[PDB]
Design a protein around this nucleic acid. Sequence first.
RNA 1: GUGGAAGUCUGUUAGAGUUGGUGUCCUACAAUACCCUCUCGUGAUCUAUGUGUAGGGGUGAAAGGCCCAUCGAGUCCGGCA
RNA 2: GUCGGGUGAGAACCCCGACGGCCUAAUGGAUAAGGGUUCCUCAGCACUGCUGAUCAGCUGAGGGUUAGCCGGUCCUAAGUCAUACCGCAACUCGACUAUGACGAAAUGGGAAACGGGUUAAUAUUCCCGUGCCACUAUGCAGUGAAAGUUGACGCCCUGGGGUCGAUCACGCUGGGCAUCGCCCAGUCGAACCGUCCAACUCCGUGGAAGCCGUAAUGGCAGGAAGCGGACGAACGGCGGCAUAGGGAAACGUGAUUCAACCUGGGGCCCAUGAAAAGACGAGCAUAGUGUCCGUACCGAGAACCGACACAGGUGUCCAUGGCGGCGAAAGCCAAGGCCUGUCGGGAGCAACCAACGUUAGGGAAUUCGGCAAGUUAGUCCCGUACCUUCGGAAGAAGGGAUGCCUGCUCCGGAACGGAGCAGGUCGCAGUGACUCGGAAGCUCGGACUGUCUAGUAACAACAUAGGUGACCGCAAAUCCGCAAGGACUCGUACGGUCACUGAAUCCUGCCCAGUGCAGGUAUCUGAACACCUCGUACAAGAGGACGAAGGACCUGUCAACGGCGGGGGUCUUAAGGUAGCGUAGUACCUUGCCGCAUCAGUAGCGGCUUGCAUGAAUGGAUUAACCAGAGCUUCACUGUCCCAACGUUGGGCCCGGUGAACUGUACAUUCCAGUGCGGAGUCUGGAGACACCCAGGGGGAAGCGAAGACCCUAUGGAGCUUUACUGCAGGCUGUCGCUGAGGACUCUCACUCCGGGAGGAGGACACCGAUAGCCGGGCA
RNA 3: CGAGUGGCUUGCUACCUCGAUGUCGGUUCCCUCCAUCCUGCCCGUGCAGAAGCGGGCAAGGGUGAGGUUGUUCGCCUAUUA
RNA 4: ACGACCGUAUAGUACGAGAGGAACUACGGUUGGUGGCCACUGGUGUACCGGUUGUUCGAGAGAGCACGUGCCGGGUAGCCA
Lengths: 237, 73, 56
Amino acid sequence: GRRIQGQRRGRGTSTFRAPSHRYKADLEHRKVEDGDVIAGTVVDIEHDPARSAPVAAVEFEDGDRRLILAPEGVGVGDELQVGVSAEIAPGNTLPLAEIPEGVPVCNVESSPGDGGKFARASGVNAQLLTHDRNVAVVKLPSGEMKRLDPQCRATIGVVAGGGRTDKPFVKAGNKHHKMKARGTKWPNVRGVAMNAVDHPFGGGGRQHPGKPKSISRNAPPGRKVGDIASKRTGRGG
Amino acid sequence: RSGRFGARYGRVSRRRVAEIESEMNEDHACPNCGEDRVDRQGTGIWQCSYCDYKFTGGSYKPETPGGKTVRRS
Amino acid sequence: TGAGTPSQGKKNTTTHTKCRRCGEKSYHTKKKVCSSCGFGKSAKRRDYEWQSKAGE
RNA sequence: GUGGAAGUCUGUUAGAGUUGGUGUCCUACAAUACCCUCUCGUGAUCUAUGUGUAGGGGUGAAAGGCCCAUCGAGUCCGGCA
RNA sequence: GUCGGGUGAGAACCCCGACGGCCUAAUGGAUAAGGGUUCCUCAGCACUGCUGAUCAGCUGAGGGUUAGCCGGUCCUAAGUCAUACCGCAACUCGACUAUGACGAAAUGGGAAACGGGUUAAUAUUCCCGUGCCACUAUGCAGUGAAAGUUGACGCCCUGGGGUCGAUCACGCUGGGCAUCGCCCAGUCGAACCGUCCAACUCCGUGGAAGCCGUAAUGGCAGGAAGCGGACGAACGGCGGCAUAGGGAAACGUGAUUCAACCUGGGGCCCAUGAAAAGACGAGCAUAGUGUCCGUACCGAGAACCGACACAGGUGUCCAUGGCGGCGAAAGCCAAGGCCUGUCGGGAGCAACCAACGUUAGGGAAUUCGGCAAGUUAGUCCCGUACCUUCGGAAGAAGGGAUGCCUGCUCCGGAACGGAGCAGGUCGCAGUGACUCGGAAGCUCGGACUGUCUAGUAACAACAUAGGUGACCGCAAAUCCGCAAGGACUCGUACGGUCACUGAAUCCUGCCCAGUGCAGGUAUCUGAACACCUCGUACAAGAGGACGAAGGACCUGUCAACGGCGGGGGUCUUAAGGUAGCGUAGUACCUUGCCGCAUCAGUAGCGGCUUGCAUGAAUGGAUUAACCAGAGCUUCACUGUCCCAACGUUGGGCCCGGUGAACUGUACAUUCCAGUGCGGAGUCUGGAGACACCCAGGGGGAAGCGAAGACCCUAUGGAGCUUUACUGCAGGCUGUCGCUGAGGACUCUCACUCCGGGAGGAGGACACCGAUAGCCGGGCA
RNA sequence: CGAGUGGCUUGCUACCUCGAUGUCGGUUCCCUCCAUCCUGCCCGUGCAGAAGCGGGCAAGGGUGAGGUUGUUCGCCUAUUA
RNA sequence: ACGACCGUAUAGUACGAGAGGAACUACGGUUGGUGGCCACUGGUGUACCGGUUGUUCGAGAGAGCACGUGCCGGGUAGCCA
Ligand SMILES: [Cl-]
Ligand SMILES: [Cl-]
Ligand SMILES: [Cl-]
Ligand SMILES: [K+]
Ligand SMILES: [Mg+2]
Ligand SMILES: [Mg+2]
Ligand SMILES: [Mg+2]
Ligand SMILES: [Mg+2]
Ligand SMILES: [Mg+2]
Ligand SMILES: [Mg+2]
Ligand SMILES: [Mg+2]
Ligand SMILES: [Mg+2]
Ligand SMILES: [Mg+2]
Ligand SMILES: [Mg+2]
Ligand SMILES: [Mg+2]
Ligand SMILES: [Mg+2]
Ligand SMILES: [Mg+2]
Ligand SMILES: [Mg+2]
Ligand SMILES: [Mg+2]
Ligand SMILES: [Mg+2]
Ligand SMILES: [Mg+2]
Ligand SMILES: [Mg+2]
Ligand SMILES: [Mg+2]
Ligand SMILES: [Mg+2]
Ligand SMILES: [Mg+2]
Ligand SMILES: [Mg+2]
Ligand SMILES: [Mg+2]
Ligand SMILES: [Mg+2]
Ligand SMILES: [Mg+2]
Ligand SMILES: [Mg+2]
Ligand SMILES: [Mg+2]
Ligand SMILES: [Mg+2]
Ligand SMILES: [Mg+2]
Ligand SMILES: [Mg+2]
Ligand SMILES: [Mg+2]
Ligand SMILES: [Mg+2]
Ligand SMILES: [Mg+2]
Ligand SMILES: [Mg+2]
Ligand SMILES: [Mg+2]
Ligand SMILES: [Mg+2]
Ligand SMILES: [Mg+2]
Ligand SMILES: [Mg+2]
Ligand SMILES: [Mg+2]
Ligand SMILES: [Mg+2]
Ligand SMILES: [Mg+2]
Ligand SMILES: [Mg+2]
Ligand SMILES: [Mg+2]
Ligand SMILES: [Mg+2]
Ligand SMILES: [Mg+2]
Ligand SMILES: [Mg+2]
Ligand SMILES: [Mg+2]
Ligand SMILES: [Mg+2]
Ligand code: NA
Ligand code: NA
Ligand code: NA
Ligand code: NA
Ligand code: NA
Ligand code: NA
Ligand code: NA
Ligand code: NA
Ligand code: NA
Ligand code: NA
Ligand code: NA
Ligand code: NA
Ligand code: NA
Ligand code: NA
Ligand code: NA
Ligand code: NA
Ligand code: NA
Ligand code: NA
Ligand code: NA
Ligand code: NA
Ligand code: NA
């Protein structure tokens, strides 16, 4: 049997790779020696082809010009600050410890220094619940209670572009255009429509999977399709 | 609105596109001063044609329900 | 559109050219590697034991 | 009234496609051609050039389709008498 | 093509002329790739040329391609390679990271050339004239100089500026025509230098509480109109260039519409639309230098790819030549090209065929089927059903008009633009050719555009938006690799992965028994090391204890595979078909029964329906819109048929020239019987038969073509499958080493990760090497 | 119940062809058989007539058109000697 | 190389209670088949004549092209049914 489509992806051929050369920049926080002195101005508001969300262009004191992840409510001319003693204003990036409890935050660091990792997409946000000298418990958009090093920086506010998901694509044409600007193969042929040779759900006199859809975690790649290690399925119950 | 879709697509698709584009094409109050000239420049990009105040907000809305909550806290 | 006669018409791309090293028209100008002598890939002349019979 | 949206319509504009004729041809003009007929025709559009993916591997809006007239595993030589 | 004539031993097809034609986004003009001398000249015809040849893309010999300002070079793109690093038994192999290099000749970016003249063949290259760019040198100025600007960028709508072209008015020059006074061509003049400035941005002035303004949007007391100013464009205008150039001559002037080019405004994205070198920023005189590579030609129904001088295929630019018209459409005509989509002569030219024309009366009787053909047609006015997701259905349907001539009207600045009026008048017919829909209805399918079997399937198959489930906090899920490493990822749950269902609408019942996945699990099962006894002076080996994942066992879960009966008024095996839908593209019985419809209807539709053997995301039903999708009906229409005829064009037939292939055990003028391995020209018996030839439509040679695809056989093959046999990756798990300090725990020093660092986080775990048990069609 | 004839059907058999004898239905065009549907001449009748019913000789000629179905078959219509 | 039918008279007769209802024979016609012919009706008739749309030869006159006639009207001979 030939390799299934999921295996082709792993090679990282052109068809599957993301259009990097077309992308703008990796949105990371600013590395400050210390002091918190670092502050800049919002020059413009652009659209990041990589996240479909907006982005803010900023110019600091020391000459630095770097595009940053634009939360909601930031405009041209405004002022942002990066550091330990930064003001608690929307957009200002600072460690979790300095941030008061119950405030919506985005672009949270998974480890201090990495430059952000959590809460980055359209209109999402984390939630700072607890404080300690050792821990800092954050509520990630998925609802999980992430325990974090209070030294990890995070931006105040919710990510802009909220409400994108709300309106349907309406037509194949529009989806096509979204996907072209991503490293995803599109469209998608259901494995049950393929031949016996091309995918486990293939073949048969009609369209149906011969094997039960759920499948073990331990299964080798090439067979790992369908409902993976499902803790259950359906909605009923 | 969705009058350009013809009879194709259905009620739910051309109705969810008519209202979401009906509130996207409305007079929006700008956060800088108070003039209702904010129009949609792009995906999430908002700008007021009066003072040129270009800013960030929801995709189709200049302000989202969760973006008004950041102010409180 | 047949792969035959009709698809012979587009064939006007250049590929294998006169290899500087061995002197054959086997220098793939898109790969810059010879199919015959191997010039461009190996410093050693491409040679295989199957270009002739086993006991020879 | 203005405005001029649209995987919108008409359409041998250009270009792309290939429904029926089971026509013509069927030691052809042609190892897939000719004619009339028909479909799309601002978009998931068509196209040139460059460039990437290689054989149990690619590539596949999936027909086991395509990868130089070669594919339910290309071609060359060898194993091989 | 025909008549002349030329050259020649030879002339249907080589050349001149006249007459006649074909090509119009191409059969014209310029080219990319590719070809490679095919280009020009001379001399030739043994070869090549679908006939011939005095011709040639052929044979032979000679000649031909000239650049600072056209290309290449240079720059960077997707990306490619080299060296270093690491991997590998290893390499000419392999991912990352550094560095360097490569990567665009029509068609990315880019310092600079125009007019004319000349050759058999080159030509912004040579010659004549004029101008321009760069570098160096010199001289003067300049002390500025790098910040900024440019290079430099999507799709749709649209305003203004405006050259060429075309057309109109008028004048001049030349030509054409000859009832009239019209008709055609021409009326030229570059780069460059200088000069002007519209739109946009901005300043002053001003001072609108309703004004200003647009095609449209819009503007404003945060200051509108108006007035003045700064900045500021065309390949545009104007002068120079130029008693240059070019023209037989005149060597114009105004206008409209305006491709090129210039410059604004508006809209759209779950799509955001290159980079670098370079240029500007930053003067001038004079002189010096500007090397190397291409440069002919074809660019296609004979120079390219397809074995061919192949009816095939092959990118760009010229889309503004006239009438016509909505038009880059038809059609007819220029300019230019051609008569080489290259064999000819003769016959009222038969039969037969191929394209096609017309056919009385009838009008789908033809037929699986209206297949094929036909019918309708453009524009305007009147008018328009059911149904509908309110978009549509719709150009529904149905009804009327349409020319030419005369004189006008209205809109606009106007058009050689449009809309209308009155009168007049010819035909069978006024969209007079051309161009140019047949309409209506019921049902099935998939919602829609879209996709697909290059080369018998274009659909109902795929896709799709929409829906649903699943996995995962990122040192993740999923996938590639032996490894070093890598895609996803310049990504972060409004995500990306994995699957199913397939628009909207109304809904989507019951079953966890089995199978699958997931969770738990007292006890039970469960490998190896270490630990114990036994044994062996050691070892083999016997036994004991402990026991991981896994399983037993329990729970969860069907929008997870899948199921939804028999019997009686419960049994198998968990439940026992709910809404719908129903003789279905599912119904064996079947042409089910009733009805509509027809003279007649295995068809179609509606109802009924016990459904052999329908049914809810294996999605059910319903449904507007769309469809080279499947079946049916009506009006219209017609040579489809009744039932054929006559015609046109190309063949066909006879003559000249050229000149293959298939196929061939032999004999062969057979026919009717018989007989034979049961399907005989060839045996047997009869009959018939003088030989040769032309034409025909194909009865026979079980005609020719292909060592039958159908069937079975072979201890044949391959692809695919699984709870077939045996394996293997891979995942999970114990144990060994890496590996250190004081059945549960602390710590840091190895090792890991983050961090630029200081340090931060994890920590003897993880990673990796070995072993052991479980799973294990992903693979063999 | 008994005796038979034909070779349309069906079945059985495996002789013939697997280096191929092109399928069913239809169409078209040609010769034939008789076990006669019509037409000609007869017989019997439960033969008044007319109209039929059964049988005999007889293959000259005829034996058509349409609706559903791919159908053969067959079902249906209207004509018909 | 002719097959068959309908009709008229025979006849409202024979026969029969009645209803109904023959034949021999003589005529005329239709249909299928067959052979031939073109005065007649019809088809064709890109021989011919006329009308007219577009365009080109300046107009006019007269002509070319519009697929082997632009389209339309008429149509001789002949060949035909
Ligand atoms: Cl998506
Ligand atoms: Cl060049
Ligand atoms: Cl404007
Ligand atoms: K056989
Ligand atoms: Mg990143
Ligand atoms: Mg979704
Ligand atoms: Mg992609
Ligand atoms: Mg799909
Ligand atoms: Mg399939
Ligand atoms: Mg499989
Ligand atoms: Mg299915
Ligand atoms: Mg299914
Ligand atoms: Mg369209
Ligand atoms: Mg045929
Ligand atoms: Mg390509
Ligand atoms: Mg298949
Ligand atoms: Mg080959
Ligand atoms: Mg092929
Ligand atoms: Mg030579
Ligand atoms: Mg020549
Ligand atoms: Mg010569
Ligand atoms: Mg280079
Ligand atoms: Mg260029
Ligand atoms: Mg030349
Ligand atoms: Mg040239
Ligand atoms: Mg030729
Ligand atoms: Mg007729
Ligand atoms: Mg019929
Ligand atoms: Mg048809
Ligand atoms: Mg006026
Ligand atoms: Mg017409
Ligand atoms: Mg469809
Ligand atoms: Mg095909
Ligand atoms: Mg199709
Ligand atoms: Mg087809
Ligand atoms: Mg589908
Ligand atoms: Mg979806
Ligand atoms: Mg989805
Ligand atoms: Mg029915
Ligand atoms: Mg259900
Ligand atoms: Mg004999
Ligand atoms: Mg065989
Ligand atoms: Mg078989
Ligand atoms: Mg096998
Ligand atoms: Mg690291
Ligand atoms: Mg196997
Ligand atoms: Mg046998
Ligand atoms: Mg035969
Ligand atoms: Mg008899
Ligand atoms: Mg009687
Ligand atoms: Mg007979
Ligand atoms: Mg003519
Ligand atoms: Na299957
Ligand atoms: Na309106
Ligand atoms: Na076609
Ligand atoms: Na292979
Ligand atoms: Na071999
Ligand atoms: Na100027
Ligand atoms: Na015109
Ligand atoms: Na010739
Ligand atoms: Na379409
Ligand atoms: Na379609
Ligand atoms: Na179960
Ligand atoms: Na279960
Ligand atoms: Na079921
Ligand atoms: Na006809
Ligand atoms: Na024969
Ligand atoms: Na196979
Ligand atoms: Na038999
Ligand atoms: Na044989
Ligand atoms: Na047949
Ligand atoms: Na007879
Ligand atoms: Na019948």
